[PDB]
Amino acid sequence: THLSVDTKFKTEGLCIPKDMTYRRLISMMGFKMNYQVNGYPNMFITREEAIRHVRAWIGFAVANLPLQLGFSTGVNLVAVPTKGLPWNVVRIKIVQMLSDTLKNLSDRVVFVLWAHGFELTSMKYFVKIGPERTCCLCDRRATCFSTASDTYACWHHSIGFDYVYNPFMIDVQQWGFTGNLQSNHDLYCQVHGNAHVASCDAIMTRCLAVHECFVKRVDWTIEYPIIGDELKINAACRKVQHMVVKAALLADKFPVLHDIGNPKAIKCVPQADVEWKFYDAQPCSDKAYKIEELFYSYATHSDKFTDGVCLFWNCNVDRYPANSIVCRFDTRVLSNLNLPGCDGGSLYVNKHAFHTPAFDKSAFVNLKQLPFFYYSDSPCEVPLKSATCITRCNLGGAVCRHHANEYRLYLDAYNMMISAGFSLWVYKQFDTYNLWNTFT
Numbered sequence: 001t002h003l004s005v006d007t008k009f010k011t012e013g014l015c016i017p018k019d020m021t022y023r024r025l026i027s028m029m030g031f032k033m034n035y036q037v038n039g040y041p042n043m044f045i046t047r048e049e050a051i052r053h054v055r056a057w058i059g060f061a062v063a064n065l066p067l068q069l070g071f072s073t074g075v076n077l078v079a080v081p082t083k084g085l086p087w088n089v090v091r092i093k094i095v096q097m098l099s100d101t102l103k104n105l106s107d108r109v110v111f112v113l114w115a116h117g118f119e120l121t122s123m124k125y126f127v128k129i130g131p132e133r134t135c136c137l138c139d140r141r142a143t144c145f146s147t148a149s150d151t152y153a154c155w156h157h158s159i160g161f162d163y164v165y166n167p168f169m170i171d172v173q174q175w176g177f178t179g180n181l182q183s184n185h186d187l188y189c190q191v192h193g194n195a196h197v198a199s200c201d202a203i204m205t206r207c208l209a210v211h212e213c214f215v216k217r218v219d220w221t222i223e224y225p226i227i228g229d230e231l232k233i234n235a236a237c238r239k240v241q242h243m244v245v246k247a248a249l250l251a252d253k254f255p256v257l258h259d260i261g262n263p264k265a266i267k268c269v270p271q272a273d274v275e276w277k278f279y280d281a282q283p284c285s286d287k288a289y290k291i292e293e294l295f296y297s298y299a300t301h302s303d304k305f306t307d308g309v310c311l312f313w314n315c316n317v318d319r320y321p322a323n324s325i326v327c328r329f330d331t332r333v334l335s336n337l338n339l340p341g342c343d344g345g346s347l348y349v350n351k352h353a354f355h356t357p358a359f360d361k362s363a364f365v366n367l368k369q370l371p372f373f374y375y376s377d378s379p380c381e382v383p384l385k386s387a388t389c390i391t392r393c394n395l396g397g398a399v400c401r402h403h404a405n406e407y408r409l410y411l412d413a414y415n416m417m418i419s420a421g422f423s424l425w426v427y428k429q430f431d432t433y434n435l436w437n438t439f440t
């Protein structure tokens with residue numbers, strides 16, 4: 001489960017032996033590893049584990065000489081060992097930075113590294129380590145230490161603290177790359193250029209870790225803790241998914257529905273009375289028999305899916321065809337669930353980690369925004385006067401207390417979802433006109 005200290009460390013990347021282990025590395029950074037039996041058996045963590053703690057990822061790079069310390073936050077700090085700053089002021093601003101960045105993301109920090117060596121040596125200057133401690137002021141894990149008061153604090157209660165306590169890290173060069181950082185990074189990303197500074201290294205180093213671990217495909221096995229409104233959000237998206245698809249079907253009576261990017265083969269309108277077809281790039285083994293393996297791009301499938309309507313519910317493709325229903329996460333929304341990722345994309349960590357290409361308007365060229373409405377054919381068990389309440393009773397005169405209340409709940413569900421950063425799009429020929437007809 002944990003990364004053994006006895007695992008060999010490839011030194012090839014370090015400007016001083018060859019046949020080295022983590023134990024011998026850590027000792028050389030200036031740290032005593034006796035805390036194996038206290039929940040901190042290694043400063044470095046397994047890739048497996050790093051992925052579980054992606055919310056904690058902070059890229060770190062370093063350019064007696066002065067030292068420039070860079071981070072994925074685009075912050076650079078210069079330390080005069082004794083432009084530059086005293087080490088006491090630097091190490092305070094580090095803890096300040098990390099706390100600010102991570103207080104609402106993780107219970108720890110993972111330093112993501114392209115190990116040139118000079119940064120691993122620097123760690124002893126701003127990192128203390130020991131047994132796993134809880135915070136003095138709350139029951140949160142301790143991430144910081146104050147030499148002044150000899151107390152330990154989480155990211156929330158770290159104000160004025162100077163040393164980072166029990167940080168985790170990974171050297172990416174230990175994943176069998178060749179060539180320098182920028183060579184490997186620039187393959188997958190052209191949003192992060194070099195300015196020949198540490199922060200740019202830190203940024204790229206994280207950007208590339210994110211690519212290797214997330215861009216590839218969704219790992220449905222790994223799940224992430226609730227840090228926000230996940231449950232409210234995910235519930236509301238499903239309530240909408242149902243309402244929207246049901247309505248599109250009733251309106252235009254599509255013979256078939258191409259549910260693209262459905263790896264679980266589950267109908268969101270179970271009692272449909274429509275040919276329901278499931279597709280996905282990575283169908284789940286358990287249900288793979290009902291799901292066609294397919295990676296949609298317009299270039300490859302503009303001459304397919306001619307019949308009926310395509311459902312792309314958070315299936316984020318180059319360009320959607322004209323006969324589409326789409327829910328798409330606007331990667332530009334600022335959120336604790338929305339982490340920056342590869343090539344202007346972003347890593348949306350909700351229940352699972354979902355890497356998304358950057359939100360581009362050009363994808364929706366063949367579509368229009370899906371306007372808000374509420375539709376119900378169900379029975380009718382502060383009087384609401386809405387043109388967008390498409391029920392029997394609304395055109396009738398006043399609307400029943402049942403539908404009236406369902407509207408106010410669906411509306412909150414819509415507003416919850418839009419606020420969460422999702423956007424709704426539909427075939428340009430869509431209109432509620434036909435849903436009014438379903439009554440007369």
Ligand SMILES: Nc1ncnc2c1ncn2[C@@H]1O[C@H](CSCC[C@H](N)C(=O)O)[C@@H](O)[C@H]1O
Nearest residue numbers: 261262263280281282294295296313314315
């Ligand atoms: N270009 C593409 N073509 C087909 N499936 C894709 C795709 N890009 C991503 N996917 C798949 O679409 C899914 C997106 S996340 C799950 C979305 C699902 N329809 C739902 O409502 O929960 C993943 O299974 C992913 O592998």
Ligand SMILES: [Zn+2]
Nearest residue numbers: 057058072073
């Ligand atoms: Zn970051």
Ligand SMILES: [Zn+2]
Nearest residue numbers: 135138154157
């Ligand atoms: Zn605390």
Ligand SMILES: [Zn+2]
Nearest residue numbers: 189192207343
């Ligand atoms: Zn990048």
Ligand SMILES: [Zn+2]
Nearest residue numbers: 370371372373
């Ligand atoms: Zn709607």
Ligand SMILES: [Zn+2]
Nearest residue numbers: 380393400403
């Ligand atoms: Zn009614």
